[PDB]
Design an enzyme around this catalytic site. Structure first.
Site, mmCIF file in Angstrom:
data_model
loop_
_atom_site.group_PDB
_atom_site.id
_atom_site.type_symbol
_atom_site.label_atom_id
_atom_site.label_comp_id
_atom_site.label_asym_id
_atom_site.label_seq_id
_atom_site.Cartn_x
_atom_site.Cartn_y
_atom_site.Cartn_z
ATOM 1 N N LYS A 171 -11.529 5.125 2.491
ATOM 2 C CA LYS A 171 -10.560 4.371 1.718
ATOM 3 C C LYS A 171 -11.388 3.550 0.739
ATOM 4 O O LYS A 171 -11.889 2.497 1.126
ATOM 5 C CB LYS A 171 -9.717 3.491 2.641
ATOM 6 C CG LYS A 171 -8.298 3.267 2.156
ATOM 7 C CD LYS A 171 -7.664 2.109 2.910
ATOM 8 C CE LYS A 171 -6.172 2.295 3.098
ATOM 9 N NZ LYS A 171 -5.593 1.198 3.911
ATOM 10 N N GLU A 176 0.838 -1.217 0.000
ATOM 11 C CA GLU A 176 0.000 0.000 0.000
ATOM 12 C C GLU A 176 0.867 1.258 0.000
ATOM 13 O O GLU A 176 0.546 2.233 -0.686
ATOM 14 C CB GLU A 176 -0.933 0.045 1.217
ATOM 15 C CG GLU A 176 -2.097 -0.926 1.172
ATOM 16 C CD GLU A 176 -3.018 -0.784 2.373
ATOM 17 O OE1 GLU A 176 -2.626 -1.206 3.489
ATOM 18 O OE2 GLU A 176 -4.141 -0.262 2.205
ATOM 19 N N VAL A 235 -5.707 5.191 8.760
ATOM 20 C CA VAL A 235 -6.624 6.293 8.469
ATOM 21 C C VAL A 235 -7.171 6.949 9.749
ATOM 22 O O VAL A 235 -7.620 8.094 9.718
ATOM 23 C CB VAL A 235 -7.755 5.871 7.494
ATOM 24 C CG1 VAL A 235 -7.147 5.395 6.183
ATOM 25 C CG2 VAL A 235 -8.671 4.794 8.074
ATOM 26 N N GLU A 236 -7.103 6.241 10.876
ATOM 27 C CA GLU A 236 -7.414 6.837 12.182
ATOM 28 C C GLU A 236 -6.477 8.019 12.454
ATOM 29 O O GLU A 236 -6.931 9.097 12.840
ATOM 30 C CB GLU A 236 -7.334 5.802 13.308
ATOM 31 C CG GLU A 236 -8.482 4.795 13.347
ATOM 32 C CD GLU A 236 -8.281 3.588 12.439
ATOM 33 O OE1 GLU A 236 -7.514 3.686 11.454
ATOM 34 O OE2 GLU A 236 -8.900 2.536 12.711
HETATM 35 C C1 LIG Z 1 -6.359 -4.466 7.485
HETATM 36 N N1 LIG Z 1 -5.856 -3.081 7.301
HETATM 37 C C2 LIG Z 1 -4.905 -2.723 6.419
HETATM 38 N N2 LIG Z 1 -4.663 -1.391 6.484
HETATM 39 C C3 LIG Z 1 -5.470 -0.880 7.426
HETATM 40 C C4 LIG Z 1 -5.710 0.469 7.986
HETATM 41 O O1 LIG Z 1 -4.996 1.524 7.503
HETATM 42 N N3 LIG Z 1 -6.646 0.602 8.964
HETATM 43 C C5 LIG Z 1 -7.357 -0.473 9.434
HETATM 44 N N4 LIG Z 1 -8.280 -0.271 10.413
HETATM 45 N N5 LIG Z 1 -7.175 -1.739 8.947
HETATM 46 C C6 LIG Z 1 -6.263 -1.997 7.968
#
Ligand SMILES: Cn1cnc2c(O)nc(N)nc21
Ligand SMILES: Cn1cnc2c(O)nc(N)nc21
Ligand SMILES: Cn1cnc2c(O)nc(N)nc21
Ligand SMILES: Cn1cnc2c(O)nc(N)nc21
Lengths: 120, 119, 118, 120
Positions: free
Chosen positions: D99, D21, D72-73
């Protein structure tokens, strides 16, 4: 409470902070929510006892087309004022003025203001 | 509460204040929201513990198609009432009646009336 | 604070009428789990928040890997297993959506929505 | 309590738990809402008593595009955080970081986190 809506009204308007906005114009959208009682209207079937949707649209158009402001905050505020003032049966109202195409460099759907006004 | 929904039912009806909306007719849309308990239906997996979603659709269709009124208010009001009366398992309901193509010179998606009712 | 997964689409063979159980149809799920996210938002840590990928998988399991008469029981078994496996989840809201039910008529969808908590 | 919205900002960023990612990147979407009084803005037509919608865009973009978090939190937290620091006139906010194309093998529209942040 019960509710009249007008979803996604669309105008062309000249409103803005920049004088370039004033000259060129842009799209302006309005969502409306007004609250009253519709139990009477619904048990009756006589428009004399509710607020006429066609007039609520016209009201909105006057502020967005027949007048110019710098802020979408002034469009929302005027709309709200004429509503409560002209219509004594409507209790509360939520009003959202939308600038789908503002002059900002980036990628987005829209910016917007939203106010909710009430009788004191 | 827990909620059953029917989203964006579309009808053709002849409702309206002016005589010409009665002659020509137009599209009418209805969103249904009804409040009741579905914990019993969930753990039972047996329909008699819940309300039939077909009977709901049909009930609204009857109001919008088989009848004609001057006002959408009136459409919203009869649905709420005929739900409550016919269904005691339902505590509370919200009905929204959308006119998408009203005769207003202007540019808009829709006008509508939303009511929430109870006994 | 909240975590979301929107418009999960599965194909399943749920339903009351036995014909629905052979044919099958589309089933959509809106998941909405509540909590605090201050911990993860400062730490930048998947320890201090919930895995969104697992939450999908659990929904996939209830909709694709078992069959029920009711959509209400898809919703229930999802909401019960969420509160089983995830203590830090204050509360959850599941909305199960049947877009193509066998009602003669014109609509977008019928739907259930429950909210569960400890 | 009145509100300024910014809907469906789109950014391209490299946020992710997985190092893949992080190399490839993907789309990120942000919704913003902020609570404040806009009644004075709506009468004066004066932007000073309100808040620049443009500067708000930029604040959000700094986080999504100029920095890189695993979660993203973290993205929504800093946004809420940076909003509350710079603007005293804003009472509360809500931030949804979306996302839309996460690496989940399945069929869905989007996964997301919304937070709400107030001051004392
Ligand atoms: C499973 N997973 C992969 N990337 C993530 C992310 O940024 N946040 C959360 N909650 N889960 C994720
Ligand atoms: C930057 N900018 C230009 N016009 C504006 C308006 O009406 N409101 C806000 N908040 N910002 C604006
Ligand atoms: C103007 N107008 C015509 N029909 C109407 C209805 O059903 N409700 C409201 N509020 N206005 C209407
Ligand atoms: C008619 N019908 C078929 N399946 C159903 C379900 O899961 N719930 C409700 N309320 N009605 C259904």
């Amino acid at each position: 409470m019960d509710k009249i809506y007008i979803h996604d009204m669309e105008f062309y308007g000249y409103h803005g902070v920049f004088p370039e906005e004033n000259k060129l114009g842009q799209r302006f959208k309005v969502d409306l929510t007004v609250e009253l009682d519709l139990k009477r209207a619904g048990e009756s079937d006589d428009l004399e006892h509710s607020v006429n949707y066609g007039e609520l649209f016209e009201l909105c158009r006057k502020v967005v087309e027949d007048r110019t402001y710098k802020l979408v905050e002034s469009i929302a505020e005027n709309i709200a004022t004429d509503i409560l003032k002209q219509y004594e049966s409507i209790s509360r109202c939520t009003i959202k003025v939308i600038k789908p195409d503002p002059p900002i460099p980036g990628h987005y759907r829209a910016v917007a203001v939203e106010i909710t006004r009430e009788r004191p």
